[PDB]
Amino acid sequence: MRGQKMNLTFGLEEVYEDAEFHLGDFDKVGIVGVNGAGKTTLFRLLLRELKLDKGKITIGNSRIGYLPQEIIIMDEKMTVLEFLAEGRPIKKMETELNYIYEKLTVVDDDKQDRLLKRMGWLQEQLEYFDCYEAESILLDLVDSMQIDFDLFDQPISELSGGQKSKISFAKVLYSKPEILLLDQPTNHLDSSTKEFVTKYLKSYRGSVLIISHDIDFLNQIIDKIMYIDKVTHKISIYEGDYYTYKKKYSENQLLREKMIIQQEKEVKELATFVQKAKQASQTNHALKRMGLERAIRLDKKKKNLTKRDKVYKRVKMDIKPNREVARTPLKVENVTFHYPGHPILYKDLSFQISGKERFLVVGENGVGKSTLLKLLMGINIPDKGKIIFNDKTDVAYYSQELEQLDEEKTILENVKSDEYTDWKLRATLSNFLFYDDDVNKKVNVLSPGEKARIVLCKVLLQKANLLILDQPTNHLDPETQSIIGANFNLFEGTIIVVSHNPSFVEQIGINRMLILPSGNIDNYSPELLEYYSN
Amino acid sequence: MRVNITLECTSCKERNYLTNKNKRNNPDRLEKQKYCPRERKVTLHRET
RNA sequence: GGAGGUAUGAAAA
RNA sequence: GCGGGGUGGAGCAGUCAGGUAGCUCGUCGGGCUCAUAACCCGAAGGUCGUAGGUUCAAAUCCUGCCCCCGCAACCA
RNA sequence: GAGCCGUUAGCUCAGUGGAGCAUCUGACUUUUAAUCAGAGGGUCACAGGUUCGAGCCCUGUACGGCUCACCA
RNA sequence: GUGGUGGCGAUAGCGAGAAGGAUACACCUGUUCCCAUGCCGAACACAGAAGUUAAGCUUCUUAGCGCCGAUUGUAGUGAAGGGUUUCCCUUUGUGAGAGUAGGACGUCGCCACG
RNA sequence: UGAGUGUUUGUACCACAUGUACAGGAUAGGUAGGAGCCGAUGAGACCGGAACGCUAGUUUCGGAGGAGGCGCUGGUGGGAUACUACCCUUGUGUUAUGAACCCUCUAACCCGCACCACUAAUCGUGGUGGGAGACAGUGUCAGAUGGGCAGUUUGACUGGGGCGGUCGCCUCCUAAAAGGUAACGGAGGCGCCCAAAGGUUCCCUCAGAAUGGUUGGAAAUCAUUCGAAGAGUGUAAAGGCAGAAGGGAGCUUGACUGCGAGACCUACAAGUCGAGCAGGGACGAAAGUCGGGCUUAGUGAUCCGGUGGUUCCGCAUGGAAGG
RNA sequence: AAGCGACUGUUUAUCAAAAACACAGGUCUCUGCAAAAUCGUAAGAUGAAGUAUAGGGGCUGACGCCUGCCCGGUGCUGGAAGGUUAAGAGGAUGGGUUAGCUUCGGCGAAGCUCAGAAUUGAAGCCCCAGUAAACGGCGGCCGUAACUAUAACGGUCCUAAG
RNA sequence: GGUAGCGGAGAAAUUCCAAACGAACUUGGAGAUAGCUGGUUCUCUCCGAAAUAGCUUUAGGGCUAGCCUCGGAAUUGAGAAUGAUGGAGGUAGAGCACUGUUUGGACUAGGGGCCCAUCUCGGGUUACCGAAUUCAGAUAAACUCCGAAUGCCAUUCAUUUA
RNA sequence: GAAGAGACGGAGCCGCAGCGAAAGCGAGUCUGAAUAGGGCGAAUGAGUAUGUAGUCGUAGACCCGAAACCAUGUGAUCUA
RNA sequence: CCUGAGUACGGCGGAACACGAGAAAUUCCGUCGGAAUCCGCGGGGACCAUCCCGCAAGGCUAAAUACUCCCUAGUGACCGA
RNA sequence: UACAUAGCUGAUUAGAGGUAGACGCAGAGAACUGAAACAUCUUAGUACCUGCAGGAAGAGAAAGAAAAUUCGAUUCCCUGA
């Protein structure tokens, strides 16, 4: 994999500017960058989906296994087995091959040569992707991540975010690829599932490029780290792990900063003398002469004076509730719920939040965490029981799968509210790193991370006193995650949160944790680990 | 930001016309119906 | 029991 | 004519690189003290010199203007 | 020699239709000092002119302080 | 006489006032129709003829405004000269602006209906 | 410029070992051959040791014993069983080794070290020791440093020169009613902008004032009247524009291609205008208008280089390189 | 009696004899000997037929009292991890040609040939520390005393230090 | 006797190196180059400038054009002067119709004082300052409702001329 | 061949066809889709060899004149 | 069987070819690497294929050409102190 | 140092130096100047210095010129230009 003089500019905002990179074979490269840096765009260039405006991007002829950052569900009714089966081209070729036989009967002596060649390749190609896979895939689920066979016959759209990630990851492995391009392979996975993915990637003999915002996950796998810069629009490749990249990078910006400082001092020195000559008496001929001579050096200095790159601005969040929390914000009493045709997730579930409380809904993948939160908002109507919100409680919902954005509309149109004027919307969008005409961009072209900021911005603009957040740190760059956690910690309201990120929950400072599926309203503590172990 | 651009005939890929556009006002590649002297007929010309 | 070494607050009444 | 500056009472950031007006001392009020100082707790104090442009948005960018500081205003 | 700068209460300073300090008087104190309060003290250096009207503008005279001040 | 349509520098205009709709033009009656209002059949478009000269419209009176504007005189100035020569004067030719006498409430055409 | 040692390494043979997904009898690597194969040259079963191991078994070494088993056959599975060939993963070694470093050696090279001979000799050349040593020295190449040294550059205008200002383009006044006309004369602008702020069809007329009217105030929006331009025309000024060039809407891209009679301007290079013809179009019923914008600034010769197109050339010829 | 130079000396032959140079003394620095330094392309020389109490270079200039603060910048000295970095090594890939295949099509081995990425690659530079008898540098604003004045005193900006 | 010029020597002055040393002398490259100054020799005849535009590391140089000279070609004679006619233009002058500058008068919004009464509020005042309007009167290179004399362009025009 | 004229020597040079960058076409050709327009040419013909004169180019180029630069050499009998 | 080896050639750095590295032949020098050999080798202006021409890395070779310090015999629209 | 070589002795052999201020080949090799400045470039491989020469030198018998199909060592002249 090699790229030279890479250039790419969507409209007025550019991604790559004369960027270059060379990746040797059998390198587990960790791709790192802030949201929008252009990490996903790099893969699109490798997959030839995009074309560089200028430059050459070189890819090996080997087959590539691509794990998209977003799940591709062509139709809502697609079953998990259909989704997985689409990983291999067995079905596609057979449909073509079946048609080839039909053409052979219709045509006698005209197209036989073309048909016979096409049939031969399909058979040879079909045998290369040995048709025994029908059994291998069935057992690949068992050995991979303990994916139950009941899910195997269930619509994919109905799976949980963690479950979908397992299916998509298995599909990539099912294709039997030669190069692995994983775009956030552990976005929704729980702690247990991440262990399997880590072990497989350690053992994987081939080259694997990983886009991840999980530093610990990368450090266990990565041997080479590629950093996509958002301000310089360039690519830098280091040898080592995430910390080594940070150490090397921090030193380089320090050494660059000192260079720019000394160039400024010399310019100031000349400038100070030029001014002294400029204001001297016209009768001081020699000083006036020397002043012009230094004016020439000053001009040449100012034309070779390196500009310091503008440090990328970090998100600023100030979430405050309009009204005040009550001692009983939310009352859940004897609530039972089941998805039609499936086992009851919880029976007679009853809990009561206290107000300005950090409430963690713990659990594992596919256990009902997101279902419970959907239950409170009203997306799911409880099969039994009642859910009562105090009239003083305003609720803000952050969905897990980013289902609250209109892909067709722009960023500004999505955030439009009756309670906020235009400049207020722009100011807040600037606090979320959407500057100037970046707000007129369609949501369909944004990255998952940038979309997550829009959803968060929507949550902030509500000024609710109860925050129902379902995996908020997902898709966010590591810097933005810490900002998110710190500001929530200071939030003066009730927080119902779900998070598989250990760092995020620690910053928020959880008070009570609700374990699933075994309903257990418990005080928060390192005993969270005990429930995870058990 | 205003910059000069070239409009190329989508049919024969001939760089036929020279114009300019403001990137901010027209972020997407400009397209016009212009006479293509090589093909001697009006065709869709898109910016490159 | 005994010996040596080990912050400010005026003047006069 | 050449530069440097006009942000709270004073001194200073923030200006380059447009989103949100700050730090220090000081002042007012209440505490502690026999009382003062120190110390502790509250509060106030600027629409950023001024007038127009640019912008969705100006302390910040552009233009002029008014003030204050330093230098210069002539060499054989 | 020339051109400017000024002259306002007892002192130091503001200012075309007075402030500090000082001095008195009160309070507080056994009495004071310090505080706190109140009071008085010229008005514009002197003449002339412009103006409806001059401390403010214009002249002249005094008094002082600034500057600049000749040739190869 | 009215209605179209023009030419000519408003001497054609503006203001004020008077008369008429027989025809014609208009207002005028409606939105079903093609068509339309960044709303409104006000406009545009369409269909029709209940009433009116009220208005526009045409005719007429008026010099109040605007417009046109002679002659005389003067400023200026080409040429030829002079002086006490920043300026001023003389001869010869030309000659305004301003001010005024006065003109002017239009004229020269084609077509349809009377 | 040559010897070894060791270490960490990459390559390549040669030894070995491993192959457990499901089902399947069960630890099934793939392909080819495969009815026969192996064993007194010690088979089966058995005992232990060792390795693997997914813990199920697999592989292997030894102890005894002495002749048997395995395969085809059978069902399973996508794939079938023995054994042979080609090999394929995986992990250990052997060897060839290629590198980097480690020290060590000595015979190259060096000694302004001692002694010996030429020999009168503090040169030199040989000889013997000693020291050093594949280093140094020297050759080629390369990076750095290098006023130690060398060759040079380091504007013009200008009420002398310096300092300050200016240098190209557009507009006005100077400019003396054609045009042109200078000053370090008096004033301002330009180094763009617009995807509509272009074209066309249709439609519309402003600024201010008075009066009345909630928030609302001098002044937001609304209504009548007066109001010939006192507005607007992206952007300086001049000229022009209300038969619009100002403003709104629909459709569009003529902000077209090949040109171009004839003019203006002009030392040249350039600059400016242009009816009209052809091609193929936009708008409009048609007339017709459209080769950007109310007009006049918004720009830079050649050389050199980039990108695209090209029925052009191609150093014997076909290509190619290069043009 | 004052300035300058300690002194005797030296200097612009031919407009300057001096406060200029030199000087003894001081200090810093280089130099372990085939010394450093210098002449020379080299050989060969001086340094020395000397050996750190010696030799070269910089500055200061008898003697007496002293020689303050700053190592941020520039040099020099040290450091060796990192970043940057030439030739050389290395040769993944892409063109040209064409044996041979071809469905005008086009593809295309080997050889030669035109370019060539990764990787390897010292010093230096970046960077860290020291160094001023090394090159050099050594600040502002506001208020404050019971006559007035002034500010022992207090705030505040900046700096490597004021 | 030694040190020789891309050098030597220098108690150091750009000091000396054969009577001139910021780089000795001699010979040669060599007739260096000189957009600079000076000089450039007989006669008569015909004609006869320019000291301007543009560009220029250009300004006392140069190039093209303009002005002079010599030869040639051709013309529906295209040049000059004057007259007649028709034109384009905004100067002198004049004027205030626009835009600046501006004087006085009438009136006054409004502003300033000032009282009563305040709920700054409701008034009554300076002949206090006074917008806008209007009457009268000025002014202009970058003002013009107007507008010459001249000059300029042109005429198959007319006379003279070449 | 007399240091001559002259003879021979037709290789070569200029002219007689231009147009286009070129392939190429040709009184036409180039641009162009064009039998259009336009550019350059033909219609619309004189050149060439030599002499002579004017001017220009390469040469010192009308004559004289630097401070200087560079390369061999000669100078320490003055002076350091 | 023999027909010129550290040669031809290549890299690097220079130089000569009208040709200033340019696409650059050809030739020479320094340094390092480094062939084939008759089915072979070189050139025909990068390079490859075909064709054509030639046979390097050994040597010698007169004439036509350049000049005149000299000696002889002359010549001149060459000088005349 | 044993053989020997090196040294030393003798004989033998052929060199030294000068020119003709010319012509030839080679080593090394400027600057003024031109570019209207100047560094690539030009002056120019010139001037100078040095070595080697001969009456001439140098070159010369194709690993050539070509692509008319051919020519047939080199040198010099005209032309190509």
Ligand SMILES: Nc1ncnc2c1ncn2[C@@H]1O[C@H](COP(=O)(O)OP(=O)(O)OP(=O)(O)O)[C@@H](O)[C@H]1O
């Ligand atoms: N719309 C649905 N239709 C049918 N079944 C559903 C639906 N939503 C969820 N399920 C099932 O509910 C079960 C758990 O629901 P839930 O979405 O809450 O999982 P979860 O707790 O959010 O897990 P995680 O977030 O880690 O992926 C899943 O197995 C899922 O298959």
Ligand SMILES: Nc1ncnc2c1ncn2[C@@H]1O[C@H](COP(=O)(O)OP(=O)(O)OP(=O)(O)O)[C@@H](O)[C@H]1O
């Ligand atoms: N078609 C597009 N049009 C306009 N902008 C685009 C388009 N495609 C990408 N961008 C911009 O490119 C930027 C970077 O691309 P990309 O989506 O790959 O970032 P990312 O690093 O993958 O995001 P994340 O890490 O959060 O998933 C995005 O911010 C996005 O706004």
Ligand SMILES: [K+]
């Ligand atoms: K109606």
Ligand SMILES: [K+]
């Ligand atoms: K009427």
Ligand SMILES: [K+]
């Ligand atoms: K009238």
Ligand SMILES: [K+]
């Ligand atoms: K060596």
Ligand SMILES: [K+]
């Ligand atoms: K003068």
Ligand SMILES: [K+]
């Ligand atoms: K339009």
Ligand SMILES: [K+]
């Ligand atoms: K002295």
Ligand SMILES: [K+]
């Ligand atoms: K002394």
Ligand SMILES: [K+]
């Ligand atoms: K002293």
Ligand SMILES: [K+]
């Ligand atoms: K003396």
Ligand SMILES: [K+]
């Ligand atoms: K001296």
Ligand SMILES: [K+]
């Ligand atoms: K001393």
Ligand SMILES: [K+]
């Ligand atoms: K010393």
Ligand SMILES: [K+]
């Ligand atoms: K010193």
